[PDB]
Every structure is written in structure tokens, then in C-alpha cells.
Structure 1
Amino acid sequence: SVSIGAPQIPNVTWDDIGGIDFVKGEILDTIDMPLKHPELFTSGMKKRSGILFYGPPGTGKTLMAKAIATNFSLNFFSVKGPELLNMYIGESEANVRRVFQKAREAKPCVIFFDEIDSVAPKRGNQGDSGGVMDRIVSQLLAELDGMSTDADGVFVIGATNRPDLLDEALLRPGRFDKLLYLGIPDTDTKQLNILEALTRKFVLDNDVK
């Protein structure tokens, strides 16, 4: 990765975050089940497009993605939506194409777009001032749609806070199939696990209950 770039993974693991009880099965099936069972799964059928998060902000979505990348140790790159946009159209599309193709060179790998909302909105809804995004989003679509044909070992993950503005072309399975969620913990057990993970490293006095 260093030769290729992104060392992003600082430090994370399952113990470092709670509330993963229900999602664990789905994410693990989407990620490692093919890894542990690739040849068996070699039936030339549609692989799971990827993952898509949403919900209240600060719900650990980005931490969750980093934990996935670290625990399963697949080549990772973080794409900050606004960093892509250039002064005029086109060169942003070139940036998207080059990043995706270099990822397709480094296989198998994991790719995640941070705050997809700001680079994959519903074009037309907001006042189209320049129509710049219309074309960038177009990029992602086909390169997402062109992933399954050959790019095996690469899967997409998305983080959102206002998913009501996402362009619908993405939501289709093949483009996006698992619309995973991470929101407020409902039952006291959720916060209990999240807290024991939160204070896992604390040097606490026994008074802590």
C-alpha cells in the first residue's frame, strides 16, 4: 500500500466499537464469505455490489468502515467527495476514472466513498447551477456498473447522513444492494456493549458501575 499510497488504517478492531451485533452477519457475508469460500462461490453469478450506510450523523459509520478495512486487511482508499471536484467538468471525471482503475489494478481491494451524498446527489432537484455534478455522477455509475464484469475482489461502501438526496440510479442492486444502517442504540444492551467497548481501555476504579 505504501508503494501504492493510502496507509489510511490507523488502528481499529471489533472490540473498538459496539452495536455491530446485527450488522456483523451481513457485512461478514458480503466481505469474507467469498474470501473464505471463493472457489465454491465461483458460479459466474452476480456478486454483491457493495454496502451503503445511512442514519444520524456520528453513528460510527466511518469508524465502522475503517474497522472493516483493518480487520479484514484489504487494500483501502478513502475518497473525500469534494476533493474530487475540479474547477471545470471533465478533469474530475478523469480523476474518478484513474482512481477506480488503479484500484482495479490493486486487487483484491476495498473502496469506500466518504459522504457519497455530496458527489452523488439527485441531479435536477437542487438548482442546477452549471450542471457540473450531472456528469461526475455519470462517471461513477458506469464504472460501478462496469465493476462486476471483470473487477472481482473489489467492492464499494458508502456513508450518508441525508440519503433522501441520493441519485436513484445508484440504489439498484448491482450498483448498490445492501442498504445497511447504523443509528441510535434502542435497547440498553446496545449502549452497554458500546460503552464497555468505549471504556475497554480505561483504567477505571471499581466504583464504576
Structure 2
Amino acid sequence: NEVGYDDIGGCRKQMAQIREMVELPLRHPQLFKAIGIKPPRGVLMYGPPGTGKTLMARAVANETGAFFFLINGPEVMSKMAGESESNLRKAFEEAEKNAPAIIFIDEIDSIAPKRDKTNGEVERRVVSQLLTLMDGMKARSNVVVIAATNRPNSIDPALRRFGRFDREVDIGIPDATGRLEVLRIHTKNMKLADDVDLEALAAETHGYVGADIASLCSEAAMQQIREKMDLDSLGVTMDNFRFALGNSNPSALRETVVESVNVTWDDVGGLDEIKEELKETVEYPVLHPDQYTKFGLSPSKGVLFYGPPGTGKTLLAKAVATEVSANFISVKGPELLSMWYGESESNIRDIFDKARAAAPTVVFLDQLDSIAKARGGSLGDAGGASDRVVNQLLTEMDGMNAKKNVFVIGATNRPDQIDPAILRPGRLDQLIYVPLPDENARLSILNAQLRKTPLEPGLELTAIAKATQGFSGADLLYIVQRAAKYAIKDSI
């Protein structure tokens, strides 16, 4: 009753990559002879939870028959007399007594993280025990160490070295029909019907790293046994998976919306000129990045926007997350602002570090007047001031690689609180004021809502749009919101 190599799919590229560093030091070690070099030991896996890090560790152990070992994160961390430093070297000599062997250290960020916070506890001397333990592994082709974590930036950078932990690999998200392989594993034991199809499930499940897919087929079985009031032939149906989509949340309990708000290109009313200029954003240079290396110049870094509120600074700001389906993030203005004074510069650091790590990505900003603050702090006198929040992002956004899909886009309502160095070229180049729509573009503003509702064709579409003589794009949503409560009126 153990798992194998065929037990998990979707990560077939990462499966064949990780199988080289475990089989070749153990099965055929003669390739490292007469070539001079030494076979490496550490393999580093990292990703979001629910991706199958411990599942991949147990699958490679039982398929080779090696001496598998397990070292847990919060388990071996003692405060008695330094017993964690004696139990780490106890696990290394026990793995050295049996050949071949493999150890596994999950949640390695929990054991001795980076010293930006603690810096004085016993964890400083815990990690240095692990430095001399892995470097003293002169026994060739015996022990192979693998690790798993969730945040590669919280760990100390001394582990990412030649000897102990090199050759890191990121277990990504199975988006390219990888959820079909997960559905082939889990639903092969359940009894199925003719109406179900696994190809019509992966196209609608954005994200879905794999743990919620196993929860989706179990919850679909709960809907099938719900109608049985209580010889038995239940099966499944297509409506059970559609019931499990709406009545169960995806991996969004930590943050509410990070992916999209389910919009498209034609959901903003009018503004066909900014739809053309949005094709010079990250849609353009991803599929051809060698043209800028041929032409020898960096592409555009940032486009800025400012104008009247309610003209498309949330619809078009989230339409970039749907036209390429990149690794979107959602962050508010004063939500970046923290209560601590020392966190005032590191909170923009981890956001920008996730942008270069989740390439290609889409970031945005709202209400930069709380962030720019062109005077540079109001009065002073305090233990902390409002001056490091703007002077850090103006330099960190310059210290980014051009070929890493990093950019910014703006959405403000006050053109005077923003600093002149905020609107600097090279950081925010195109000073584009968003305009109020004219009479030629305010017809498709109402049509952005009439695409989904069945409007009667006898009603004139331009008769309600002709009442606008200088209105905004959100004001015609107020009419269909007023008509949302004025249409029924008799069906209570």
C-alpha cells in the first residue's frame, strides 16, 4: 500500500529532472569516475502547499528501495541543552551506516531561518551545525539529501552554495493540461458515468494545485450520496463537479482575490485607443524578447495613469490578469503601509521579490498619494517617519533585471501629491492622462453590462446613453444598478 512513480502526474518535466540526481549517484556511480568531479548531494524543492512535495519524496523512496529517512521541521527543535545539534548529527550517522540511503527535511524554513528577525537565538548555532555536517560528507555516492519548503527567501542564503544545497527546482502549477493528469489518478477508482469528461474540468479550474482537486472529487461524492434517503448504484455526473465548483472555495483562504475577477477585453466601456496601447505592455515582449537584445535597448518599464475616478482603473487594471493569465497579485495602497517603522522598507521588498520569482507577473498600484508623499514626511520628531516608503521603491525598481518581466502600472486621482521622481522616465515613462469619454464611446459603456443581461431589443440602446452630457464611465453602471431594483417590482 505504497505510492509509486505513476502515482502523480502534471510535473513530468520536474519528475525527469529530479530522477537524475537520485538514480545516477546510486545506480551507476561510474559516470562520476574519470571525469574528475564529485556527485552532488542536496536537492531543493520549493512551492505552494498542496503541490505534492512530500508525495514526491515518498514516491522516489519506495521506487528505489533505498534506506529512506524522515526529519521533521518542528519536531527536532529543542531548548534543553542544544539537543537539536546532537539529533541532527545522530540522523546523519544513522543514514551513513546503511548504503544506499536518502533523508528528507520538510519545512526547512522552520529550522533556523534567516537572521533578519531572531539573530541571537540558538538557531544561529543550529544552521552552522548543518554547515559542517553536509561539508564533512566525504563518503562518496552513499547519502542523498532532499529538502522541501514553501518560501525560498526566508531561508538563510548560506545553504544555497556549492557543497550542501545546490540545483534548486521550483515545483510549478500544473496549468498546461496538468490537472487532467491529476483527475486521471483520483477518479480512476470511483465509478463513473458517460456524461463526465476530464477535459471539460481543467479549463475552468484556474490554479488548483492538486490538493483541492482531491477535495473536489470527494465533495462531488457527497452530493451524489446526499439524495439517497436510505442494492446501490450511484456513479457520478457532470452536475456533481459543477456543484463542487460553486459550493467549495479554491486555494484563496489566505488572500481573497489574487488571480482575476473574471473580466475580458471588451468589459471596459469605450477607450479603444488604450486597448491598442495596452498591446505594448507585457503581451508584446514575452514571445519575442531577443529583439530588444538585437536592438540593444531595454523596453518600456512603467506606464502611469491619472484622471477622473471611476473611468476604468479597476476593470482595465484587472483585465491584464485575464488577457495573458499571468501570475497576478493584488495589493492595496495603505495595506502596503505597516504599523511598524522597520517594516516600512521591507514590505515593498518581498512584493518585488515575488514579482521576479513569479515571472511573468502583473502588479498594480492604487492610491499612490498615501505612498508617494512628495513633501517627504509631514513633521517628523517620531521614532520612524514617512520617508523610507517612497525612497526605497524608487531605487529597488531601478535595481531589477530588464529580462525578467517586471513593470508597474498606475491608478491615481490626485496629480499633485505624486512626486516628480515617481513620474520619472525609466521608472514611469508614459504620462498618460485617462480621458472622460465622449458621445462616441459612451454607447459601449452601457453595452458592457448589456452583454450578459437579456435586454429587450425594442428598447433603444442609444436613448438612455444620450442623457449623458459629461458623465463618467461608472455613472452608467448606476443606471443599470438603479434598473436592477426597478425591473422586477411585482414578483414578491
TM-score by length of 2: 0.39
Measured after TM superposition, the shift of residue 119 of structure 1 is: 0.8
Deviations 1:118-156 (A, max 9, x none): 1112124x7335572211101110111112x35621211
Partner of residue 448, structure 2: 197
Q: Indicate the residue corresponding to 2:13 in structure 1.
A: none
Deviation at 1:93, TM superposition (A): 1.0
Say which is worse superposed, 126-135 or 104-113, in terms of deviation: 126-135
1:185 to 1:12, Cα distance in 2 relative to 1, 3 A: same
The alignment partner of 1:145 has SS state of: coil
Q: Which blocks of at least 5 consecutive residues in structure 2 are unaligned? A: 1-172, 174-206, 210-250, 461-492
**Matched AA of 2:279:** L
What residue number does 2:300 align with?
Answer: 48
Decide which of 250, 253, 275 is 1:24's aligned counterpart.
275
1:11 equivalent in alignment to 2:236 = no
1:205 alignment partner AA:
E
- Residue 373 (structure 2) pairs with residue 121 (structure 1): yes
Query: Secondary structure at 1:180's aligned position in 2?
Result: strand
Query: How far did residue 20 of structure 1 move?
Result: 2.6
How many angstroms apart in 2 are the aligned matches of 1:91 and 1:83? 12
Matches within 5 A, 1:168-187: 168-186=420-438
| Counterpart amino acid of residue 83 in structure 1 | E
Q: Does 1:139 align with 2:392?
A: yes
SS of aligned partner of 1:164: coil
3-state SS of paired residue (1:103):
helix
Q: CA deviation at 1:175?
A: 0.9
Q: Normalized per residue, which structure has more helix?
A: 1
Give the 3 Å change call, closer, same or farther, for CA 202–141 of structure 1 in structure 2.
same
Pairing of 1:27-176 with structure 2 (within 5 A) = 27-43=278-294, 44-124=296-376, 127-129=378-380, 130=382, 132-147=385-400, 149-150=401-402, 152-176=404-428
Structure 1 window deviating more from structure 2 (64-73 vs 27-36): it is 27-36
8 Å Cα contact 1:123-1:133 kept in structure 2: no
Task: Write the distance in 1 (CA, Å) between the matches of 2:344 and 2:412.
Answer: 21
Cα distance in structure 1, aligned partners of 2:278 and 2:339: 37
In structure 2, the residue corresponding to 1:34 is in which secondary structure? coil
Contact 2:326 2:362 in 1 (8 A): yes
Q: Highest relative contact order (Cα 8 Å, sep 6+), 1 or 2?
A: 1
Q: Post-superposition shift, 1:54?
A: 0.9
RMSD, aligned CA: 2.2
Match for 2:389: what amino acid?
I
Q: Distance in 2 between matches of 1:190 and 1:150?
A: 36
Tell me the distance in 2 between the aligned counterparts of 1:17 and 1:35: 24
| Match in the other structure for 2:76 | none
| Cα 1:86–1:151 shift into 2, 3 Å | farther
Deviation beyond 4 Å, 4+ runs, structure 1: 1-6
C-alpha contact 1:104 1:151 (8 A) present in aligned 2: no
Mapped to 2, the partners of 1:138 and 1:127 lie a distance apart of 15
Identity among equivalent pairs (%) = 52
**1:42-100 per-position Cα deviation (integer Å, ceiling 9, x unaligned):** 24412201221111111111111101221122211122121122223221211111111
- Give the Cα–Cα distance (whole angstroms) in 2 for the partners of residues 132 and 77 of structure 1: 27
Write the distance in 2 (CA, Å) between the matches of 1:208 and 1:181: 35
Q: 1:151/1:100 Cα in 2 relative to 1: closer, same or farther (>3 Å)?
A: farther
- Answer yes or no: is the 8 Å Cα contact 1:17–1:198 preserved in 2: no
CA contact (8 A) 2:306 2:413 kept: yes
